[PDB]
Ligand binder design. Structure first.
Ligand code: NAD
Ligand code: NAD
Ligand code: NAD
Ligand code: NAD
Ligand code: F45
Ligand code: F45
Ligand code: F45
Ligand code: F45
Ligand code: BGC
Ligand code: BGC
Ligand code: BGC
Ligand code: BGC
Ligand code: NA
Ligand code: NA
Ligand code: NA
Ligand code: NA
Lengths: 253, 253, 253, 253
């Protein structure tokens, strides 16, 4: 309850799923947390549940929403120590010829440019606090996936951007790192599985895709985030895999 | 002169620099080449110089330009075997706070979405020929760079997209690979160096950034592309580094 | 003081440097720690200093020493939860033609096979406790280094071995991970620098090799180890970089 | 037939499998080739078959054999341009507790130290010719595999060693690169499959482990080697994947 005491953290998409687990992990560490989400339902309930967490409605694709997010965080808590760029989306499976340039642009707006915009607006305050940035990317940005060309491209961009910004901000003492989760059991996972012909088979396949034989939990991503913020003081520009081992391991005509 | 005989290749941004070297390499291999560029000057001269190469004016950010590029290639040569997505740009060095969301969007349009659009429109013809895609990414997408957050993000996206599409197109026999060059001596390199306080010092630094002690040549990228198209039949989804060893190698408070 | 309470940890080479920092981190987390070292001096003093740590003289290249290490840990503390394979050595800088096959074999014995032997003898007890293995590898195993062919080869082997064993032990609930440090200020660093023509210049160069502008501390490696043991329950087979950003970032004839 | 004309190449383990395909590729490129193997049967027949190839009996684990290999190559052909370190072995599948330190040492002798020894003895001649080294590593050194801790460790060592030596030899103009194959259909693959309960099922599984839906051919590894030797003049320290896409791609308790 003291590892990140006195610190102020913003978690985008913190109303459910991974983001809510990150929120819980930081509150449990002693931090005050600002839950950003475009949806009221989960984040408002989370603010009532957790002393030390508050909810601010904010769509990270709307620059003026993000400006107000940052200015309200400073107005209410007087400092900013860590930004967790978790808001993002995975579309349903799509064959390459079923994708569109305009759909790709929209997904870039959320998964890439919303992370960019909050980070840019927060960096002046992070420099004052010697704070840090944590981006939530994905394993499939590193190794690829099927029926997801736009999603994979956006996460490859997030991981690379993390390394570029780590270089730029290192002279000012601001660390920039990312987490690449694999299959984490969240409402997004549940929603996508429900679109499949056999949802229960899809979930079983998802569980067995990891050597550890289960999907991950939001709380496990949250523990990795608290580590990066509070104890990884010589880490910058890293990609922390939270995947259960999915990337490990695997007539001529 | 026979390694890629009878084949038809499209090279975007083929009017100068790396793209022109790729054009030359494929002509030397026996292929017919379509030089795509938004600028007339270099590509028109290249078409007069090289029997087997022709020039088509096409801005890869304009979908109707790319549609006409593909339909004219098929109309004139009857098949399409390889697309080399080389068109791209590196902005001048920019601190993160000096970048803009709108500038980032524009660079994504060229470096990422123009590659996406040509590949999408070409894939029906590549499936008929069991052809292949070669994307020109960058080393800095993998390891980062300073004063280039948008550029690095776009190339991280290209490399990841390459792996996703390789998975999607493998059942149809179409390979999708990328080349990640390091410092290659091109007109873009010369133009950026000329913006520096000391251009000659900037070039010297660029030469010594590689263990091999020089910058690369467009012809060397071109040889790597001809290898991927004509001889790498068990390679798909790879990132071929052409960097001179730049990524190799490198009080407590 | 409770994150790893009730747990028993063995740290090889725990008498000084990184190993001693790992020992301190685990004691501070609430664990009981067995300090293994071939040298009495530092580890004996550490055992007097730290309630909860004890010293066992053991050369990890001597199989019977390691057998007795494991059997004494179980005899004295009744369980084994985590093995940290930290013992290792970096020879002085050596040109490739100055190395020998026999020198290479000796370095493999310490850096690779001593890690293998302790892990093998500990695994039956780790399976009973659902414990975990943490190997201390090196950044240069991933990216290379000059004048160190044998050292680099041994650490490449440790990192790969970590992934293989993670796959083999995942069905039994035992996680296997590694830490790849960059420049950490330790007595080994101090000893190597003292062999250089200008030691102070060598240290200054070492500090500036990181974007963060300093070398790392043993305590920072220790915090990463405690994270992997106590909170990274969905991580197996990962390589956790603790390098200060050294791997980030960087006429044609 | 001219890409590597006038050049002299040594291929270890060239009597069958991948090595024989590399031999054939270099002869087809115009080179003279020395086939090194510990076994007479395949290499002697290959020397009768191929004008331009000769056979020298040599066990790469025996330093005096390798000394004589190099001195006989120079005595017979007057130069040395490329060494392909292909000799190696994969043991039958072994659980970690079924391995031994002594078995691990023996596999290191072949897969790692035999590559080291030939490279060391050849480097003085490679510097005179501005020649190059090609090591045959494995995909599983990078991503791991099950029931193969020693094999995976040896190939992780080869890949890392490649990068270290590339740094050391770059000032002398000698490039050092590796190829990491995935499933290639060779006599070793056939022998291992025959030990399985259902050999035909094992082979079918091996074919489908690649997105491309088949195993690779020795000729495809050979084409990659000829590219690295003859056309990759700005590549050093790279790992060229020849895997068919195996590394691509893939309730909470
Ligand atoms: N679940 C997985 O297996 C998985 C794996 C790897 C990466 N990820 C990444 O983790 C992150 C969280 O994923 P999840 O599974 O928890 O998803 P989720 O859909 O369950 O939760 C996402 C949350 O973000 C919010 N959000 C969406 N768009 C927003 C916007 N424009 N502005 C503000 N908030 C917005 C949503 O309302 C929701 O509360 C995403 O970046 C996703 O790409 C998820
Ligand atoms: N030069 C390097 O060191 C280097 C290193 C790594 C990657 N790259 C990449 O290699 C590629 C080529 O770089 P270069 O140095 O040869 O650049 P260059 O500027 O010398 O040449 C680029 C060419 O592409 C054309 N082009 C630009 N925008 C276009 C558009 N919208 N439509 C069509 N054509 C367009 C230009 O007119 C020009 O002919 C780029 O993708 C670049 O990111 C270059
Ligand atoms: N210091 C760095 O910059 C750095 C960077 C990357 C990796 N590493 C790795 O971290 C580990 C620790 O390095 P360090 O700098 O703390 O070294 P160090 O020399 O300061 O400490 C090593 C300790 O291990 C002990 N040891 C050595 N051989 C042993 C054996 N046979 N049996 C038992 N104990 C033995 C030594 O007596 C000593 O107490 C090593 O594996 C090293 O390769 C160090
Ligand atoms: N076949 C695959 O799927 C695969 C995949 C990845 C890597 N590899 C690697 O490719 C290389 C060749 O494998 P392969 O499948 O062709 O094997 P193979 O067993 O079919 O052929 C190996 C050859 O090397 C020779 N050899 C073995 N030990 C030797 C020694 N001490 N001295 C000299 N020659 C020796 C053998 O006699 C044989 O002719 C090995 O390094 C292997 O690890 C193979
Ligand atoms: O959100 C998902 C996810 C899963 C893993 C990831 F690494 C990631 O970044 C996102 C998810 C959830 C449920 C199904 C799927 C999925 C299923 C089939 C697919 O073809 C696909 O690309 C994704 N992905
Ligand atoms: O175009 C360039 C380039 C260089 C290397 C690359 F890998 C790449 O993709 C692009 C280039 C040319 C000249 C100077 C620079 C450069 C100099 C200072 C910088 O801060 C920077 O980010 C790039 N880049
Ligand atoms: O122990 C060292 C070290 C440094 C960094 C590492 F990643 C690592 O695994 C080990 C160290 C300490 C002091 C100097 C050096 C060093 C200096 C010059 C060299 O040529 C070299 O290969 C290593 N290495
Ligand atoms: O030699 C083989 C091989 C296969 C792939 C590789 F990347 C490699 O370096 C070697 C091979 C051939 C046949 C079966 C197997 C194999 C089967 C089950 C295993 O558990 C295993 O680790 C390897 N490996
Ligand atoms: O909907 C799937 C899962 O989503 C997670 O974010 C919640 O913490 C779980 O309670 C829920 O079962
Ligand atoms: O302008 C830099 C270089 O650009 C390359 O693309 C050309 O091939 C060279 O002739 C020129 O010197
Ligand atoms: O000798 C270099 C450094 O080694 C570290 O292991 C110690 O914790 C420091 O006190 C010491 O300054
Ligand atoms: O034995 C498996 C395969 O091994 C390869 O090295 C040979 O070229 C093939 O003819 C043979 O079928
Ligand atoms: Na609250
Ligand atoms: Na022409
Ligand atoms: Na004690
Ligand atoms: Na012959």
């Amino acid at each position: 309850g003291t590892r990140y005491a006195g610190k102020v953290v913003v978690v985008t998409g913190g109303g459910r799923g991974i983001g809510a687990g990150i929120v819980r992990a930081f509150v449990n560490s002693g931090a005050r947390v600002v839950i950003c989400d475009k949806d009221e339902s989960g984040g408002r309930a989370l603010e009532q549940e957790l002393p030390g967490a508050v909810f601010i409605l904010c769509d990270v694709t709307q620059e003026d929403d993000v400006k107000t997010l940052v200015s309200e965080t400073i107005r209410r808590f007087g400092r900013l120590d860590c930004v967790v760029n978790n808001a993002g989306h995975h579309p349903p499976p799509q064959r390459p010829e079923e994708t569109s340039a305009q759909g790709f642009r929209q997904l870039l707006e959320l998964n890439l440019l919303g992370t960019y915009t909050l980070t840019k607006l927060a960096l002046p305050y992070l420099r004052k606090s010697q704070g840090n940035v944590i981006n939530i990317s994905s394993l499939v940005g590193a190794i690829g996936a099927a029926q997801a060309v736009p999603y994979v491209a956006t996460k490859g961009a997030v991981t690379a951007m993390t390394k570029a910004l780590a270089l730029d901000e290192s002279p000012y003492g601001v660390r920039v790192n990312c987490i690449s989760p694999g299959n984490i059991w969240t409402p997004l996972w549940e929603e996508l599985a429900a679109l499949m012909p056999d949802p229960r088979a899809s979930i079983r396949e998802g569980m067995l895709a990891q050597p550890l034989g289960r999907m991950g939990q939001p709380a496990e991503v949250g523990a990795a985030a608290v580590f990066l913020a509070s104890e990884a003081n010589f880490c910058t520009g890293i990609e922390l895999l939270v995947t259960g081992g999915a990337e490990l391991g695997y007539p001529d005509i």
